[PDB]
Short mmCIF file of all heavy atoms in Angstrom, two decimals:
data_model
loop_
_atom_site.label_atom_id
_atom_site.label_comp_id
_atom_site.label_asym_id
_atom_site.label_seq_id
_atom_site.Cartn_x
_atom_site.Cartn_y
_atom_site.Cartn_z
N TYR F 58 77.66 -33.78 -7.23
CA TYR F 58 78.93 -33.31 -7.76
C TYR F 58 80.07 -33.73 -6.85
O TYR F 58 79.96 -33.69 -5.62
CB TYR F 58 78.90 -31.79 -7.89
CG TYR F 58 80.06 -31.20 -8.64
CD1 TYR F 58 80.15 -31.32 -10.02
CD2 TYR F 58 81.06 -30.51 -7.98
CE1 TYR F 58 81.21 -30.77 -10.71
CE2 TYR F 58 82.12 -29.97 -8.66
CZ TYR F 58 82.19 -30.10 -10.02
OH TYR F 58 83.26 -29.55 -10.70
N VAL F 59 81.18 -34.15 -7.46
CA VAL F 59 82.35 -34.62 -6.73
C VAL F 59 83.44 -33.56 -6.85
O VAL F 59 83.84 -33.19 -7.95
CB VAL F 59 82.84 -35.97 -7.27
CG1 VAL F 59 83.96 -36.51 -6.40
CG2 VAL F 59 81.70 -36.96 -7.34
N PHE F 60 83.92 -33.09 -5.70
CA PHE F 60 84.87 -31.99 -5.66
C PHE F 60 86.29 -32.53 -5.76
O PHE F 60 86.68 -33.45 -5.04
CB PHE F 60 84.70 -31.19 -4.37
CG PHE F 60 83.40 -30.44 -4.30
CD1 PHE F 60 82.32 -30.96 -3.61
CD2 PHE F 60 83.26 -29.22 -4.93
CE1 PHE F 60 81.13 -30.28 -3.55
CE2 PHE F 60 82.07 -28.53 -4.88
CZ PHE F 60 81.00 -29.06 -4.19
N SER F 61 87.07 -31.94 -6.67
CA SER F 61 88.44 -32.38 -6.88
C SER F 61 89.32 -32.00 -5.70
O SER F 61 89.08 -31.02 -5.00
CB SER F 61 89.01 -31.77 -8.16
OG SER F 61 88.69 -30.40 -8.26
N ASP F 62 90.36 -32.80 -5.48
CA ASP F 62 91.34 -32.57 -4.43
C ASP F 62 92.65 -32.06 -5.03
O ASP F 62 92.85 -32.06 -6.24
CB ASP F 62 91.58 -33.86 -3.63
CG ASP F 62 91.72 -35.08 -4.53
OD1 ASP F 62 92.34 -34.97 -5.60
OD2 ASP F 62 91.20 -36.15 -4.15
N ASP F 63 93.55 -31.63 -4.14
CA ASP F 63 94.85 -31.14 -4.59
C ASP F 63 95.68 -32.26 -5.20
O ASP F 63 96.55 -31.99 -6.04
CB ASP F 63 95.60 -30.50 -3.42
CG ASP F 63 94.70 -29.67 -2.53
OD1 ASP F 63 94.01 -28.76 -3.06
OD2 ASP F 63 94.68 -29.91 -1.31
N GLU F 64 95.44 -33.51 -4.79
CA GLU F 64 96.26 -34.62 -5.27
C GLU F 64 96.04 -34.89 -6.75
O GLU F 64 96.99 -35.20 -7.48
CB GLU F 64 95.97 -35.87 -4.44
CG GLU F 64 97.04 -36.95 -4.55
CD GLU F 64 96.57 -38.16 -5.33
OE1 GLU F 64 95.51 -38.72 -4.98
OE2 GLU F 64 97.26 -38.56 -6.29
N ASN F 65 94.80 -34.78 -7.22
CA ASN F 65 94.51 -35.06 -8.62
C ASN F 65 95.10 -33.96 -9.50
O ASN F 65 94.75 -32.78 -9.31
CB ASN F 65 93.00 -35.17 -8.84
CG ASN F 65 92.65 -35.91 -10.11
OD1 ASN F 65 92.11 -35.33 -11.06
ND2 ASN F 65 92.95 -37.21 -10.14
N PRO F 66 95.98 -34.28 -10.43
CA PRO F 66 96.67 -33.22 -11.20
C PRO F 66 95.70 -32.42 -12.07
O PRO F 66 95.63 -31.19 -11.91
CB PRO F 66 97.68 -34.00 -12.05
CG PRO F 66 97.88 -35.29 -11.32
CD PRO F 66 96.58 -35.61 -10.65
N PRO F 67 94.94 -33.05 -13.00
CA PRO F 67 94.04 -32.24 -13.83
C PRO F 67 92.65 -32.10 -13.21
O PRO F 67 91.99 -33.10 -12.94
CB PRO F 67 93.99 -33.00 -15.15
CG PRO F 67 94.48 -34.41 -14.83
CD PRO F 67 94.77 -34.47 -13.35
N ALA F 68 92.20 -30.86 -12.99
CA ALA F 68 90.81 -30.67 -12.59
C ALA F 68 89.87 -31.13 -13.69
O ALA F 68 88.84 -31.76 -13.42
CB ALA F 68 90.57 -29.20 -12.24
N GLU F 69 90.20 -30.82 -14.94
CA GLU F 69 89.48 -31.37 -16.08
C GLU F 69 89.81 -32.85 -16.24
O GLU F 69 90.93 -33.29 -15.99
CB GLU F 69 89.84 -30.59 -17.35
CG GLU F 69 89.82 -31.31 -18.72
CD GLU F 69 88.54 -32.06 -19.07
OE1 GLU F 69 87.67 -32.29 -18.19
OE2 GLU F 69 88.39 -32.44 -20.25
N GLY F 70 88.81 -33.63 -16.65
CA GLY F 70 88.95 -35.05 -16.89
C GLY F 70 88.27 -35.92 -15.86
O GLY F 70 88.00 -37.09 -16.14
N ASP F 71 87.99 -35.38 -14.68
CA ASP F 71 87.28 -36.13 -13.65
C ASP F 71 85.79 -36.15 -13.95
O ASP F 71 85.22 -35.16 -14.41
CB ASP F 71 87.53 -35.51 -12.28
CG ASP F 71 89.00 -35.33 -11.98
OD1 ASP F 71 89.76 -36.31 -12.13
OD2 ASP F 71 89.40 -34.22 -11.59
N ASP F 72 85.16 -37.29 -13.69
CA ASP F 72 83.72 -37.38 -13.82
C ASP F 72 83.06 -36.47 -12.79
O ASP F 72 83.42 -36.49 -11.61
CB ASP F 72 83.25 -38.82 -13.64
CG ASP F 72 83.97 -39.78 -14.56
OD1 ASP F 72 85.01 -39.40 -15.12
OD2 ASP F 72 83.48 -40.92 -14.72
N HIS F 73 82.09 -35.67 -13.25
CA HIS F 73 81.43 -34.74 -12.34
C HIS F 73 80.58 -35.47 -11.31
O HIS F 73 80.39 -34.96 -10.20
CB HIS F 73 80.59 -33.74 -13.13
CG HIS F 73 79.84 -34.35 -14.27
ND1 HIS F 73 78.87 -35.31 -14.10
CD2 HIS F 73 79.92 -34.13 -15.60
CE1 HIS F 73 78.39 -35.66 -15.28
NE2 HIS F 73 79.01 -34.96 -16.21
N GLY F 74 80.06 -36.64 -11.65
CA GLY F 74 79.24 -37.41 -10.74
C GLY F 74 77.80 -36.97 -10.65
O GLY F 74 77.04 -37.55 -9.86
N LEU F 75 77.39 -35.96 -11.42
CA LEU F 75 76.01 -35.51 -11.40
C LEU F 75 75.09 -36.58 -11.96
O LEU F 75 75.48 -37.38 -12.82
CB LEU F 75 75.86 -34.22 -12.21
CG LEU F 75 76.55 -32.97 -11.67
CD1 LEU F 75 77.04 -32.11 -12.82
CD2 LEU F 75 75.61 -32.18 -10.79
N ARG F 76 73.85 -36.59 -11.48
CA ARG F 76 72.85 -37.45 -12.08
C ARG F 76 72.46 -36.89 -13.45
O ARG F 76 72.78 -35.76 -13.81
CB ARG F 76 71.61 -37.56 -11.19
CG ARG F 76 71.43 -36.41 -10.22
CD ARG F 76 70.35 -36.73 -9.19
NE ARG F 76 70.19 -35.65 -8.22
CZ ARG F 76 69.47 -34.56 -8.43
NH1 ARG F 76 68.84 -34.36 -9.57
NH2 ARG F 76 69.39 -33.64 -7.47
N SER F 77 71.76 -37.72 -14.23
CA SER F 77 71.42 -37.34 -15.59
C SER F 77 70.49 -36.14 -15.64
O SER F 77 70.39 -35.49 -16.69
CB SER F 77 70.78 -38.52 -16.32
OG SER F 77 70.85 -38.36 -17.72
N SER F 78 69.81 -35.81 -14.54
CA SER F 78 68.80 -34.77 -14.51
C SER F 78 69.32 -33.42 -14.06
O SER F 78 68.53 -32.48 -13.94
CB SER F 78 67.64 -35.20 -13.61
OG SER F 78 68.04 -35.24 -12.25
N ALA F 79 70.62 -33.28 -13.81
CA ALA F 79 71.20 -32.02 -13.38
C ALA F 79 72.19 -31.42 -14.36
O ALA F 79 72.64 -30.28 -14.14
CB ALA F 79 71.89 -32.19 -12.02
N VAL F 80 72.54 -32.13 -15.43
CA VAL F 80 73.58 -31.68 -16.34
C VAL F 80 73.18 -30.37 -17.01
O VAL F 80 73.99 -29.44 -17.13
CB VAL F 80 73.88 -32.78 -17.38
CG1 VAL F 80 74.81 -32.25 -18.45
CG2 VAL F 80 74.47 -34.00 -16.70
N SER F 81 71.94 -30.30 -17.49
CA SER F 81 71.49 -29.11 -18.20
C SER F 81 71.54 -27.88 -17.31
O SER F 81 72.06 -26.83 -17.70
CB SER F 81 70.08 -29.33 -18.75
OG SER F 81 69.44 -28.10 -19.02
N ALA F 82 71.02 -28.01 -16.09
CA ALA F 82 71.06 -26.89 -15.15
C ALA F 82 72.49 -26.48 -14.85
O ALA F 82 72.81 -25.28 -14.86
CB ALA F 82 70.34 -27.27 -13.86
N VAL F 83 73.36 -27.45 -14.59
CA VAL F 83 74.73 -27.13 -14.21
C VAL F 83 75.43 -26.37 -15.33
O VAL F 83 76.02 -25.31 -15.10
CB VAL F 83 75.50 -28.41 -13.83
CG1 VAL F 83 76.99 -28.14 -13.78
CG2 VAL F 83 75.02 -28.92 -12.48
N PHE F 84 75.36 -26.88 -16.56
CA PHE F 84 76.13 -26.23 -17.61
C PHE F 84 75.48 -24.94 -18.08
O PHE F 84 76.19 -24.02 -18.51
CB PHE F 84 76.43 -27.21 -18.76
CG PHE F 84 75.38 -27.28 -19.84
CD1 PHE F 84 75.29 -26.32 -20.83
CD2 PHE F 84 74.53 -28.38 -19.91
CE1 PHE F 84 74.34 -26.41 -21.82
CE2 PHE F 84 73.59 -28.47 -20.91
CZ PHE F 84 73.49 -27.49 -21.86
N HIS F 85 74.15 -24.80 -17.97
CA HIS F 85 73.54 -23.51 -18.30
C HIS F 85 73.93 -22.44 -17.29
O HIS F 85 74.27 -21.31 -17.67
CB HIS F 85 72.02 -23.66 -18.37
CG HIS F 85 71.52 -24.12 -19.70
ND1 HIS F 85 71.17 -25.43 -19.95
CD2 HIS F 85 71.32 -23.45 -20.86
CE1 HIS F 85 70.77 -25.54 -21.21
NE2 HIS F 85 70.85 -24.35 -21.78
N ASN F 86 73.91 -22.78 -15.99
CA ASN F 86 74.36 -21.82 -14.99
C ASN F 86 75.84 -21.50 -15.17
O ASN F 86 76.26 -20.35 -14.98
CB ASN F 86 74.10 -22.37 -13.59
CG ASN F 86 72.65 -22.22 -13.18
OD1 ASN F 86 72.25 -21.19 -12.65
ND2 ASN F 86 71.86 -23.26 -13.42
N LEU F 87 76.65 -22.50 -15.53
CA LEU F 87 78.06 -22.25 -15.79
C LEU F 87 78.26 -21.28 -16.94
O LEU F 87 79.09 -20.36 -16.85
CB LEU F 87 78.77 -23.57 -16.08
CG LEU F 87 80.26 -23.51 -16.38
CD1 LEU F 87 80.99 -22.80 -15.25
CD2 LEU F 87 80.82 -24.90 -16.60
N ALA F 88 77.50 -21.46 -18.03
CA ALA F 88 77.60 -20.53 -19.15
C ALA F 88 77.20 -19.12 -18.73
O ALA F 88 77.88 -18.14 -19.07
CB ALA F 88 76.72 -21.01 -20.30
N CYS F 89 76.10 -19.00 -17.97
CA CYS F 89 75.67 -17.68 -17.52
C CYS F 89 76.74 -17.02 -16.65
O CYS F 89 76.98 -15.81 -16.77
CB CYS F 89 74.36 -17.79 -16.75
SG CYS F 89 72.88 -17.74 -17.79
N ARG F 90 77.38 -17.79 -15.77
CA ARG F 90 78.38 -17.22 -14.87
C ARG F 90 79.65 -16.82 -15.61
O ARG F 90 80.25 -15.79 -15.29
CB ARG F 90 78.70 -18.22 -13.76
CG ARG F 90 77.65 -18.32 -12.68
CD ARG F 90 78.10 -19.31 -11.64
NE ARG F 90 78.65 -18.71 -10.43
CZ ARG F 90 77.94 -18.39 -9.36
NH1 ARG F 90 76.63 -18.54 -9.32
NH2 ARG F 90 78.57 -17.91 -8.29
N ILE F 91 80.09 -17.62 -16.58
CA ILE F 91 81.36 -17.34 -17.25
C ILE F 91 81.19 -16.46 -18.48
O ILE F 91 82.20 -16.14 -19.14
CB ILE F 91 82.11 -18.63 -17.64
CG1 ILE F 91 81.44 -19.30 -18.84
CG2 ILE F 91 82.20 -19.57 -16.46
CD1 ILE F 91 81.81 -20.76 -19.02
N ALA F 92 79.97 -16.07 -18.83
CA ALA F 92 79.79 -15.12 -19.92
C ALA F 92 80.51 -13.79 -19.69
O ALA F 92 81.17 -13.30 -20.62
CB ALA F 92 78.30 -14.90 -20.18
N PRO F 93 80.43 -13.15 -18.51
CA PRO F 93 81.10 -11.84 -18.36
C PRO F 93 82.61 -11.89 -18.51
O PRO F 93 83.23 -10.83 -18.70
CB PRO F 93 80.70 -11.40 -16.94
CG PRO F 93 80.19 -12.62 -16.27
CD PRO F 93 79.59 -13.45 -17.35
N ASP F 94 83.24 -13.06 -18.42
CA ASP F 94 84.68 -13.16 -18.65
C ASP F 94 85.03 -12.69 -20.06
O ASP F 94 86.09 -12.08 -20.27
CB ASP F 94 85.15 -14.60 -18.45
CG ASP F 94 85.43 -14.91 -17.00
OD1 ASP F 94 84.76 -14.32 -16.14
OD2 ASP F 94 86.31 -15.76 -16.73
N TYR F 95 84.17 -12.98 -21.03
CA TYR F 95 84.39 -12.61 -22.42
C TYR F 95 83.65 -11.33 -22.80
O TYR F 95 83.51 -11.04 -24.00
CB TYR F 95 83.97 -13.76 -23.33
CG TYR F 95 84.52 -15.10 -22.89
CD1 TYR F 95 83.79 -15.93 -22.05
CD2 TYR F 95 85.77 -15.53 -23.31
CE1 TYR F 95 84.28 -17.14 -21.64
CE2 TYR F 95 86.27 -16.75 -22.90
CZ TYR F 95 85.52 -17.55 -22.06
OH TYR F 95 86.02 -18.77 -21.65
#
Side-chain angles (χ1 to χ4, degrees):
Chain F
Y58 190 74
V59 186
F60 293 98
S61 45
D62 44 39
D63 320 305
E64 198 251 306
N65 200 247
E69 150 52 347
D71 308 309
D72 306 16
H73 41 63
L75 294 146
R76 24 191 178 81
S77 200
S78 68
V80 172
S81 159
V83 165
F84 88 79
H85 275 100
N86 282 273
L87 180 55
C89 273
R90 284 181 101 91
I91 74 199
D94 276 30
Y95 312 92

